[PDB]
């Protein structure tokens, strides 16, 4: 068993005969013949490839008959204590609220008859917990309320009970909320709505070594059970196309709406005077009781919704894997050091500096424009001709000798004459003129001279003003810009005649020559509007991403960042010119928007006493440094897919040489003695789709053309999906990747048409339709017998549509059911694209859950001194102690194998190709970056990561290298 009937290398004999069954089964010959016919019709049959080296491992013993039972047992073992806690909380009989809340120092517990007693911590297996933070003083918690199945607890910080005008801004564990018990059973569960926010304020969540406490979020459970899509959310808000029966069983993620849906009854009462979001500490000190009552009400609502949701979730996701996956996904962790702060500072500085330069440049342009007044030269400039070039009149009303001594008299006489002249203030009108002689347009940018805010030059000029694009002399495909009233900013085509000021009739044309010779309108674009009647020229709107009839208020918007090639969209001048300003704008675009989120991140710095001994006595530890952590507020299920969501960290952005502040990922640095061991799954979703199609078709790997190309394709030769499509249709690799991912999720032809019209504006629509039709016919194929078949991904789409159309759609691997808001009964053949996207992305979520469970099991069994760090998109990273860096790597590889094997097992396939058996490479590094070799050069970090901070290059190991480094064993005794 080394090659399947289709001459595709499979898993090695030693691994196959210990992961799967030795007996097993083999496909019939008819299916093999059908697959051969398919492949040879597509033209791939005769393409043998050199085999890879074989691999043999003594895999750790499994449990049960097969892989499914093994994973079930592992997940159940992981999740048992937390299900025990959840069940204990589900049966709770909550006593009444205390008659009067206490004004105390820390945690206090309230028993029968309202008695209050101070305690160190709740000391409960389960809790429902809510916190309130006053934004007026920063991010330190103010007060919180918790409920156990037996009593009420309340907590408040010293920043409320005691009053003083000085508190350190740098956060420390000494001010956070203590929950964990010292060293009744070790495992603990905390429930809440948006529980990540509450976790961020826990004292013991910032320790380097993980803890057995876990957090279950009500919002994630709601999203899983009865969540809504973005379009569905918009329509739901609009109400509170053809079928509306899904409204009564779904709602937005707000706590009030959730309680209204699951629990019902009297609505929840807010506080109209938002003393936390807009009040002050004095307001809280005055309105203590009411705020505590509101918090208790919110906690009670959260407990009720949890009671009503837990059985529903346990029913719609039976497989134990999902619960453990969420539990492990809810404990993210990002270490950082003092460098983080530096980064922020530096980035901010750079930002400001660039802005100044840009501003300066614009001012220079303004000055250079004034000269155009002479000889009415401005009247020939094809940009500034229409400005207010008016000059006002000024106003009125009401032989050498040698010096002798005592020349001081002459100086005194001159000074007296000057003083005599200084007093001639009676004639001047008191109401002064403002810079007469200067053009009015220039004067608008000049501050009043007498004001205390005066600055020299046109310091008021700035981006977003209609003047700025005119001054830069910007062009679009070499056509100058222009502003009108039937649109925002557009461009001017100079090829017009028949009287469509004389400047535009002859002066503008020359510009096009300088671009045409450097490489009824004949040019095609948005469309002319004769309402604008500039002689001898056509006006064309700048294509707005929302389609025609929309006005573009600025040519420097986000969607215009692609801009054009270096041969256009620029002006000839150099220093303080349009090109440099555009470059500066492109550089600062990212930071301009992300700076608030990035700087607002909450950071807690661990004291020395809290550090593990491995860090204190490490040779690479400095006593003067700072070590802290960020606990991202990612919600385990922020989308109906159950995919995790967070705006800051879970992003596709990475360090770039052209964007300022892009090295944020690189600032997550492991402490001394620790490393970030991780890997990126090789083409996760595409492989999932390929295996789905292959299992649907003939039960053999690679039986479909899509699966073949997925296995036998390589990026290094351009035979992978992205490169092949790019070379067949003629676009960039990234654009082809976007197109392919869009098509995979069920996007139709019109989406492709619009996207490929966006990618290059030159392409006409009547040919964009042809492009989309040809491409989809090649990929998708014809629908039915008359009026999918014949396509490379026909069977994959058939299976996806079939599973989406089922009565109760479920993930083919773990079986989690789709949200009630998308059931065919409720939607009645609506939102089909949403279901098609959901099936694939939820399969990816199941893959992630399987990875997490396997990694946790392997770490626990072999005492690997590590911890899960983060997972972003399809890449995963773990914080592992240095000495075990290699062992963990092997574990990761093992995980991959099992995971893929699992994905093959549930679809009825008893083999796994050797190509996808292991990670292409495993990364070992002390920082987060796409590759361990790049130095992360950015304008804010010009010297590189290695020069400034001292992070060396990492390692990218293979399966064989790890095997030789570890001898293929995870035991410490090796």
């Amino acid at each position: 068993l080394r090659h399947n009937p289709l001459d595709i290398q499979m898993l090695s004999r030693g691994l196959h005969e210990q992961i799967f069954g030795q007996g097993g089964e083999m496909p019939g010959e008819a299916a093999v013949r059908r697959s051969v016919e398919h492949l040879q019709k597509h033209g791939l049959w005769g393409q043998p490839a050199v085999p890879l080296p074989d691999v043999e491992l003594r895999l750790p013993p499994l449990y049960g008959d097969n892989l499914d039972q093994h994973f079930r047992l592992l997940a159940q073992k992981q999740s048992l204590p937390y299900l025990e806690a959840a069940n204990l909380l589900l049966q709770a009989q909550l006593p009444p609220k205390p008659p009067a809340w206490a004004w105390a120092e820390g945690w206090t517990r309230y028993g029968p008859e309202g008695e209050a007693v101070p305690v160190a911590i709740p000391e409960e297996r389960a809790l429902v917990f809510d916190v309130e933070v006053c934004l007026a003083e920063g991010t330190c918690p103010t007060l919180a309320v918790a409920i156990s199945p037996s009593a009420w607890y309340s907590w408040c910080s010293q920043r409320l009970v005691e009053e003083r005008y000085s508190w350190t801004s740098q956060l420390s564990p000494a001010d956070l909320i203590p929950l964990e018990v010292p060293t009744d059973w070790q495992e603990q569960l905390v429930v809440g709505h948006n529980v990540s926010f509450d976790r961020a304020h826990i004292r013991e969540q910032y320790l380097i070594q993980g803890s057995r406490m876990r957090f279950l979020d009500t919002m994630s459970m709601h999203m899983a059970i009865s969540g809504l899509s973005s379009f569905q959310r918009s329509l739901w808000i609009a109400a509170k196309i053809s079928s509306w029966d899904w409204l009564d069983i779904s709602s937005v993620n707000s706590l009030a709406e959730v309680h209204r849906l699951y629990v019902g009854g009297p609505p929840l009462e807010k506080e109209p005077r938002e003393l936390f979001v807009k009040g002050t500490m004095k307001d809280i000190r005055e309105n203590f009781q009411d705020l505590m009552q509101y918090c208790a009400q919110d906690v009670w609502a959260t407990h009720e919704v949890f009671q009503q949701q837990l059985p529903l979730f346990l029913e719609r996701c039976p497989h134990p894997v999902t619960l453990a996956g969420m539990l492990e996904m809810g404990v993210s962790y990002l270490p950082v050091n003092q460098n983080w702060e530096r980064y922020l500072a530096e980035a901010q500085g750079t930002y400001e500096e660039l802005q100044r330069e840009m501003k300066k440049s614009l001012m220079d342009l303004a000055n250079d424009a004034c000269q155009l007044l002479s000889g009415e030269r401005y009247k020939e400039d094809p940009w500034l001709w229409d400005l207010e070039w008016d000059l006002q009149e000024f106003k009125q009303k009401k032989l050498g000798p040698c010096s002798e001594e005592e020349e001081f008299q002459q100086d005194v006489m001159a000074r007296a004459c000057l003083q005599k002249l200084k007093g001639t203030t009676e004639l001047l009108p008191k109401r002064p003129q403002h810079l007469p002689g200067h053009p009015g347009w220039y004067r608008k940018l000049c501050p009043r001279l007498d004001d205390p805010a005066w600055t020299p030059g046109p310091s008021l000029l700035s981006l977003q003003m209609r003047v700025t694009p005119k001054l830069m002399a910007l062009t679009w495909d070499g056509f100058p810009l222009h502003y009108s009233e039937r649109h925002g900013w557009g461009y001017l085509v100079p090829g017009r005649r028949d009287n469509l000021v004389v400047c535009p009739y002859r002066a503008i044309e020359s510009l096009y020559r300088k671009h045409c010779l450097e490489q009824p309108s004949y040019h095609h674009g948005n469309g002319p509007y004769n309402d604008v009647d500039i002689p001898g020229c056509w006006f064309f709107k700048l294509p707005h991403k929302d389609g025609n009839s929309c006005n573009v208020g600025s040519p420097f918007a986000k969607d215009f960042l692609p801009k054009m090639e270096d041969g256009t969209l620029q002006a000839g001048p150099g220093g303080a010119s349009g090109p440099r300003a555009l470059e500066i704008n492109k550089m600062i675009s990212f930071w301009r928007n992300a700076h608030k989120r990035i700087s607002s991140q909450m950071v807690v710095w661990l004291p020395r006493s809290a550090l593990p001994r491995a860090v204190i006595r490490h040779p690479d530890y400095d006593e003067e440094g700072l070590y802290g952590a960020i606990l991202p507020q990612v919600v385990t299920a922020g989308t109906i897919t159950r995919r995790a969501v967070e705006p800051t960290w879970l992003t596709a952005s990475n360090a770039r040489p052209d964007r300022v502040g892009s090295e944020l990922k690189a600032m997550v640095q492991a402490p001394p003695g620790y490393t970030l061991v991780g890997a990126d799954v090789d083409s996760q979703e595409l492989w999932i789709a390929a295996v789905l199609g292959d299992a649907h078709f003939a039960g053999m790997h690679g039986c479909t053309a899509f699966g073949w190309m997925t296995l036998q394709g390589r990026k290094s030769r351009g035979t992978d999906l992205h490169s092949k499509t790019a070379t067949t249709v003629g676009i960039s690799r990234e654009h082809a990747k976007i197109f392919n991912y869009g098509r995979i999720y069920g996007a139709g032809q019109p989406f492709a048409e619009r996207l490929l019209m966006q990618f290059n504006h030159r392409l006409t629509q009547q040919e964009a339709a042809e492009k989309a039709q040809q491409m989809y016919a090649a990929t998708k194929g014809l629908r039915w017998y008359r009026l999918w078949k014949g396509g490379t991904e026909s069977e994959m789409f058939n299976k996806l549509e079939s599973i989406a159309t089922s009565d109760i759609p479920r993930t083919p691997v773990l079986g989690c059911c789709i949200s009630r808001a998308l059931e065919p009964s409720a939607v009645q053949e609506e939102f089909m694209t949403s279901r098609v996207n959901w099936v694939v992305q939820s399969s990816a979520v199941d893959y992630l859950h399987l990875m997490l469970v396997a990694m946790k099991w392997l770490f626990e069994e072999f005492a690997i001194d590590g911890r899960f760090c983060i997972s972003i998109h399809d890449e995963v990273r773990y914080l592992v102690r240095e000495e075990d860096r290699y062992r963990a790597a092997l574990a990761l590889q093992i995980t991959n194998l099992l995971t893929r094997c699992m994905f093959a097992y549930k679809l009825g396939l008893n083999d796994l190709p050797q190509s996808v058996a292991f990670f292409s490479a495993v990364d070992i590094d002390r920082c987060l970056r796409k590759e361990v070799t790049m130095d992360c050069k950015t304008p804010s970090n010009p010297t590189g990561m290695e020069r400034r901070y001292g992070i060396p290059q990492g390692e990218a190991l293979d399966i064989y290298q790890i095997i030789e480094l570890t001898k293929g064993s995870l035991e410490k005794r090796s």
Binding site: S374, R377, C417, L428, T455, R947
Partner: protein
């Protein structure tokens, strides 16, 4: 090639010196040119003042230092460097049979071990002073010594000497922070060069490593022909300091926190003549709408421009105009503004040529006193940036100018 027109203009307005034939790019780069004209000297003075303000005054542990232009005493033979000898002794040596057969060839060795040399860099004197200056800060290790001076370099009768004025800062640090400090200065200095630049992107930096493995950075300006070095930063460790003071190591110690250690040395050396030339090139022009408004002007920064305002007169009662111009000139100078006394000139050309001349000289503003001024004290003011005239009352002129300059320091 604008390199010709720019240099012709620079010579004409007395930024440079010497005849037209003598001046050339190679001579300017090498440092063997005749020198700089008064405007060039003023520009260099402004640049030096800005550098000193940015580097020395604002810091608690940077002190001035003076290094002699020559180092006497014996040295290592074989350097082939020029030697200093007085012509008064160039005949008494050989008189009356002093080994005059063949030892005169070996007399070269005496030349290698009897006369001093002209210092080639300011680092050596600062290293000499290190020990004595250590008392200024009670041995607090992080501290600097700065100096602006002139250095001499051989260049290729056969070979000549070029003189270059350079600013040097030697910064002694704890070894552990050394690298960090490097980066710090690498930023600061670079930003300084970007501060006054019209095109700060033309100033660039690169990283380099010594054959001994030590780190450093090179700062370049992009002249129309290529990149030219203008400043260097080097991390030197304790090698030079240890050699210069052999024997007891402890005497080099200084305090870092509570640790006595021998400092690491960081040397920053920039060339002020090359910096001035780069700034002159940057301020020059070096497309469609430019075909008409081809004004030739040097847009030097207000903080660097040698002359701020120029004074002239209109035709009328000469004595009164002269008196008021004298008073205004005294007032402007008293407040720290540099004025070009153009009211002393007898001219034979229109205002256009006057404006062109003042633009090539980089005059920020031109003030004109006219007959009507005597009635109400309103003078004409023309700005270099805008070239637009305004009427302004005398009683406030001074203040406004100061304001302008003040803003230029911060904005």
């Amino acid at each position: 090639e604008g390199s010709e027109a720019l240099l012709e203009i620079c010579q004409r307005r007395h930024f440079l010196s010497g005849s037209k034939q003598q001046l050339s790019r190679d001579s300017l780069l090498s440092g063997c040119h005749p020198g700089f004209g008064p405007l060039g000297v003023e520009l260099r003075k402004n640049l030096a003042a800005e550098w000193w303000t940015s580097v020395v005054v604002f810091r608690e542990q940077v002190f001035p230092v003076d290094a002699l232009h020559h180092k006497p005493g014996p040295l290592l033979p074989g350097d082939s460097a020029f030697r200093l000898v007085s012509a008064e002794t160039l005949r008494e040596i050989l008189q009356d049979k002093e080994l005059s057969k063949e030892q005169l060839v070996a007399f070269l060795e005496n030349v290698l071990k009897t006369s001093g040399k002209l210092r080639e860099n300011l680092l050596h004197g600062a290293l000499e002073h290190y020990v004595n200056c250590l008392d200024l800060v009670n041995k607090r290790l992080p501290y600097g010594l700065a100096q602006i001076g002139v250095c001499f370099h051989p260049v290729f009768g056969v070979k000549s000497i070029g003189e270059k004025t350079e600013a040097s800062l030697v910064w002694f640090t704890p070894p552990r922070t050394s690298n960090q400090w490097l980066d710090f200065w690498l930023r600061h200095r670079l930003q300084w060069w970007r501060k006054f630049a019209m095109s700060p992107s033309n100033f660039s930096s690169s990283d380099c490593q010594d054959e001994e493995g030590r780190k450093g950075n090179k700062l370049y300006y992009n002249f129309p022909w290529g990149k030219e070095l203008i400043e260097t930063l080097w991390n030197l460790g304790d090698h030079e300091l240890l050699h210069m003071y052999p024997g007891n190591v402890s005497k080099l110690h200084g305090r870092d926190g509570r640790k006595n250690v021998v400092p690491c040395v960081l040397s920053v050396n920039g060339d002020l003549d090359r910096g001035m030339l780069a700034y002159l090139y940057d301020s020059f022009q070096l497309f469609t709408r430019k075909k008409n408004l081809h004004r030739k002007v040097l847009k030097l920064h207000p903080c660097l421009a040698p002359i701020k305002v120029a004074l002239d007169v209109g035709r009328g009662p000469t004595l009164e105009l002269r008196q008021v111009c004298q008073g205004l000139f005294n007032e402007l100078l008293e407040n720290g503004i540099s004025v070009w006394p153009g009211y002393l000139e007898t001219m034979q050309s229109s205002l256009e040529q006057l404006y062109s001349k003042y633009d090539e000289m980089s005059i920020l503003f031109t003030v004109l006193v006219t007959e009507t001024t005597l009635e109400n004290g309103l003078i004409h003011l023309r700005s270099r940036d805008t070239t637009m005239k305004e009427m302004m009352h005398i009683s406030k002129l001074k203040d406004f100018l100061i304001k302008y300059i003040s803003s230029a320091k911060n904005v």
